[PDB]
């Protein structure tokens with residue numbers, strides 16, 4: 293299949309729904325390459341667990357952990373890694389308040405070449421156990437021969453763009469990986485990189501990151517169609533930031549405006565936001581503990597009740613994952629009848645100004661707090677004008693190269709009048725979950 297978009301394996305669903313899913317043990321398998329060295333970019337790490345996911349024969353190969361922890365949290369991570377002499381750490385600089393290192397990425401250097409994995413899971417058991425998570429697997433990139441001068445660049449500029457993303461860390465351990473990437477041929481890559489890095493971006497640098505990066509790509513490499521105002525926008529996420537006192541402050545002004553962009557010419561566009569309801573969480577495979585990874589706080593939520601009228605339930609019969617709570621984040625542009633999509637993005641970025649960027653300085657500066665990373669699937673990069681939506685995620689479509697595996701159900705279903713968004717720091721004691729328990733936080 294052209295897209296190489298996968299979900300993680302879910303313990304408890306029928307094998308039909310894990311056939312073609314990937315566990316981390318599969319990604320690190322010798323079948324994928326003979327590992328020489330790896331970098332694991334992430335947010336949360338269980339290092340004992342992580343090393344056990346590598347094949348025994350690869351467990352002493354160098355590992356770089358790229359994280360954002362400071363102070364006591366950083367000390368804890370170093371203490372976790374100290375028993376393993378092959379593990380190095382890179383603390384990503386976070387010089388803007390309330391920023392985090394959320395990017396989930398593996399760089400896998402093999403004897404045979406290089407692989408890049410951009411995904412949505414933390415490196416802890418629970419993130420790969422019963423959650424809906426997304427993975428993009430790069431091709432096996434071969435090495436460029438000694439003395440050969442070629443770019444190794446793709447039509448999507450992915451090689452230079454990934455190097456640019458790494459350069460933003462200004463980190464010596466990552467300069468080594470930049471030099472590795474320089475030595476490999478990434479020309480087969482058919483996705484566009486969409487990253488966020490912390491900073492204040494003006495002028496040309498405005499278009500490098502966050503939602504302005506998405507806007508630039510959609511302007512340059514998608515085409516607008518008639519009735520485009522009728523093509524909805526869908527955002528699907530596991531956490532929500534403080535978006536302001538009403539939709540005009542950020543959500544429908546700059547954010548929706550970037551996501552509505554198509555082509556270079558110049559709103560009624562429906563906006564569907566997908567986020568688990570309390571009932572979604574309660575009846576999930578994990579029960580209420582799934583809400584431990586859906587960190588929407590009551591303090592934030594009570595300031596923006598206007599937002600919840602956009603909320604749609606999690607439903608994923610197409611991939612057998614309605615009870616596997618989402619930690620994947622996705623954004624896409626379906627047709628009015630949801631049979632086609634103009635593009636699809638899988639990313640670590642939740643629905644937050646910190647992740648996507650917020651305009652400052654009279655619209656001249658995009659301020660981003662966090663590191664985020666995703667990949668964008670555009671029909672033009674596959675020789676197509678649109679993608680047909682795959683009807684069943686794990687089935688055999690009549691044209692796999694034209695048919696994109698959307699992992700949850702369309703059309704999204706609006707919350708009912710009795711539904712509420714999952715808010716993780718208030719109690720739920722009216723009905724027990726699938727393990728017989730209530731939710732009593734703090």
Ligand SMILES: O=C(O)c1c[nH]c2c(NCCS(=O)(=O)F)cccc2c1=O
Nearest residue numbers: 335394412413414584585586587589640
């Ligand atoms: O990007 C990610 O993978 C994630 C980032 N942060 C998370 C938090 N954040 C701390 C509470 S917070 O109120 O300070 F946001 C709690 C639970 C899960 C995640 C998570 O899964």
